[PDB]
Antibody, heavy 222, light 219 residues
Framework: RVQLQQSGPGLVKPSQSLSLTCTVT?????????WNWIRQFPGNKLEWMGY???????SHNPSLKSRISITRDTSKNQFFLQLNSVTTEDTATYYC????????????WGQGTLVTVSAAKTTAPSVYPLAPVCGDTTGSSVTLGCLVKGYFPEPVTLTWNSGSLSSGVHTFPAVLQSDLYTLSSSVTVTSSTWPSQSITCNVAHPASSTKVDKKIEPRGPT | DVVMTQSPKTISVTIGQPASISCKSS???????????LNWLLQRPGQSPKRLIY???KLDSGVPDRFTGSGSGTDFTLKISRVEAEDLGVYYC?????????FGGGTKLEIKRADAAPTVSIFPPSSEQLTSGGASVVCFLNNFYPKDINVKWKIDGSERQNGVLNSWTDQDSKDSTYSMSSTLTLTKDEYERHNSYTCEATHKTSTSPIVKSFNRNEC
């Protein structure tokens, strides 16, 4: 069907502009739809920002009064969001979403892109392995961990064994302190399988272009 | 602007049971051509909202027929004939009839299930973090139900509450449980000063807390 994918910078300085792109595939943007920008606040309140429709005609929320431009490039099958004069109050997840002009149906949203409005600096994380204490390995299951600490801004991506280990995983929401984030993730497996089958935390921080692949080593001889 | 009011705030439903939620708009949503631009959306944990219902009463493209939308004028209802665990998340209504378009505040659908005690796991600071001069002790409290749970930290038998940071997961659709992570962060020098580190979880499933401990400098 039609698919949308947002791209654009995830960290913007106060009083500058946010600039995002929505790339549409599986459908021509000059047919049938209204191409909308919607944002979700940390609270989780959703706000409609505006649209550009298949003919180029636009509309936006008066709450944004004059800060917002919505444009398209038909040769590229893309539409765009520009929002100026930003403040921390514009920190949110931005979604592009197409709805059929005719009946509001077929709602299709991109993945969502987080935009942080902050003067804080981009910092790569330290990824620390969380190896189980000896006494906790003699059970039928064993739980291993990975601590991602001191990064900015969100987000990071975290997988286990490059994504082949997906069952029994818990990745927790990041916690922000002093303009650095900390995230942890746990993975539980059959005790007999470890450490014969190694377990590695794969962490990416696109903002700082940094990746760490941390093999979890047991406590005791390795 | 049109105000959309969703009730109830939160609903907790047993798998296999029905669920009904309401959206009431401050203005009628019928239009001049006979269409009613009222949509319902579901947002699962970690994803974007996705379509359910449109035109007030119509099933959107590819949606399971377990969802039904009813109502007109200003009062709308979404019903789920039989709830499945994957239906958990936040449900929103949306109006496209009056500019500017607006969303309900959302209704969170939670799955009711059998109580479950947490699996508690504690982790000393890593050797790499210790070379950094910082030391985090991590405790996971995994797969419990219900969602209310306490965690207390002890150092050498004495409770510590400073430098503690917690983070909870959304309900898991696989088993309908909750997980939580707690992190106690110290300087390497304070960590290296004490021996015993203890994580204690208190959950309704147990009259006695779940306790996990370790000694510094011991495997």
């Amino acid at each position: 069907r039609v698919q949308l994918q947002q791209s654009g910078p995830g960290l913007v300085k106060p009083s500058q502009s946010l600039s995002l792109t929505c790339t549409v595939t599986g459908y021509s943007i000059t047919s049938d739809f209204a191409w909308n920008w919607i944002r979700q606040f940390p609270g989780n309140k959703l706000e409609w920002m505006g649209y550009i429709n298949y003919s180029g005609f636009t509309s936006h929320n008066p709450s944004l009064k004059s800060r917002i431009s919505i444009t398209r490039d038909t040769s590229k099958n893309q539409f765009f969001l520009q929002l100026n004069s930003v403040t921390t109050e514009d920190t949110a997840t931005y979604y592009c979403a197409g709805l059929l002009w005719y009946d509001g149906g077929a709602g299709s949203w991109g993945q969502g892109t987080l935009v942080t409005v902050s003067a804080a600096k981009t910092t790569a994380p330290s990824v620390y392995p969380l190896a189980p204490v000896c006494g906790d390995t003699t059970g039928s299951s064993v739980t291993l961990g990975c601590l991602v600490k001191g990064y900015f801004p969100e987000p990071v991506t975290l997988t286990w064994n490059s994504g082949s280990l997906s069952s029994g995983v818990h990745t927790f929401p990041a916690v922000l302190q002093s303009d650095l984030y900390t995230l942890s993730s746990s993975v539980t497996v059959t005790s007999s399988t470890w450490p014969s089958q190694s377990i590695t935390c794969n962490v990416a921080h696109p903002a700082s272009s940094t990746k760490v692949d941390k093999k979890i080593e047991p406590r005791g001889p390795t | 602007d049109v105000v959309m009011t969703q009730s109830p705030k939160t609903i907790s439903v047993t798998i296999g049971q029905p669920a009904s939620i309401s959206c009431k708009s401050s203005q009628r949503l019928l239009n001049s051509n006979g269409k009613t631009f009222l949509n319902w959306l579901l947002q699962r944990p970690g994803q974007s909202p996705k379509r359910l219902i449109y035109l007030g009463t119509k099933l959107d493209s590819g949606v399971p027929d377990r969802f039904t939308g009813s109502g007109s004028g200003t009062d709308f209802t979404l019903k789920i004939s039989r709830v499945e665990a994957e239906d958990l998340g936040v449900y929103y209504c949306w109006q496209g009839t009056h500019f500017p378009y607006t969303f309900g505040g959302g209704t969170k659908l939670e799955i009711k299930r059998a109580d479950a005690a947490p699996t508690v796991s504690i982790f000393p600071p890593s050797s790499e973090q210790l070379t950094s001069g910082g030391a985090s002790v991590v405790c996971f409290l995994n797969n419990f139900y219900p969602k209310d749970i306490n965690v207390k930290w002890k150092i050498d038998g004495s409770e510590r509450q400073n430098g503690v940071l917690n983070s909870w997961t959304d309900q898991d659709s696989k088993d309908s449980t909750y997980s939580m992570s707690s992190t106690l962060t110290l300087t390497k020098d304070e960590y290296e000063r004490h021996n015993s580190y203890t994580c204690e979880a208190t959950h309704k499933t147990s009259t006695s807390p779940i306790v996990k401990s370790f000694n510094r400098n011991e495997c």
